[PDB]
Amino acid sequence: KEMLSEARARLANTRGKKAKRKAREKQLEEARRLAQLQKKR
RNA sequence: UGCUUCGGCACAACUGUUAAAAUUGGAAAAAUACAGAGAAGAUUAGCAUGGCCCCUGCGCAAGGAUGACACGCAUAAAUCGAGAAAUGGUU
Ligand SMILES: [Mg+2]
Ligand SMILES: [Mg+2]
Ligand SMILES: [Mg+2]
Ligand SMILES: [Mg+2]
C-alpha cells in the first residue's frame, strides 16, 4: 500500500513548490498594504 | 622701466567650474527579520537561448547557483453551427 500510494502521487505530480509560496507571498504583501492603508487612515 | 624735442611716448592687457560653503538630494553597506535554489522520483555536471538584469575580470577569455530571471500557473472559451422540430402566426 505504501508503494501504491508513492506510485499514485509520483504518477500525478508535475508541479514545483514555489508556486505555493507565490499566492501566500502575494497575500502577505496585500495584508501589509492593507495595514499601511489603515495606518495612513 | 627704457626713450626721451623732458610734453609725454613706448611697453605690458581681463584670473577664477569663481566656496574657507550652503543646501541639496541619492546611494551601497550593516544588523534585524523575512524567507532561502534548474531539469524529470532523488542526487547531481554543465553549455546555451532572450534582455531597460547585472557583478568579478584587461577581456571578442573565464566566472558569478547551469549568475540571476523567464520557464506558463496554459482558471491563454484555442469556440459554434446544424437541423429538426416544432412551434408560432396567419389564413
Ligand atoms: Mg550556460
Ligand atoms: Mg557564465
Ligand atoms: Mg555546482
Ligand atoms: Mg545563464
How many angstroms separate the alpha carbon of residue A11 from the centre of ligand 1? Answer: 31
Rounded to a whole number of angstroms, the CA Rg of chain A reads 19
How many angstroms separate the alpha carbon of residue A3 from the centre of ligand 1? Answer: 38
Whats the size of chain A, residue-wise?
41
Closest C-alpha among A11, A9, A23, A12 to residue A31: A23
- To which H or E segment does residue A34 belong? helix A18-40
User: Terminus-to-terminus CA distance in chain A, angstroms?
Assistant: 57
Backbone angles phi, psi at A16, to 5 degrees: -125, 180
Residue in this structure with the C-alpha cell 505504501, named with its chain if needed: A2
Resolution, expressed in angstroms to one decimal: 2.6
- What technique was this entry resolved by? cryo-EM
- Residue A11 burial (CB count, 10 A): 8
- In this structure, is the CB of residue A15 within 7 Å of any atom belonging to strand B? yes
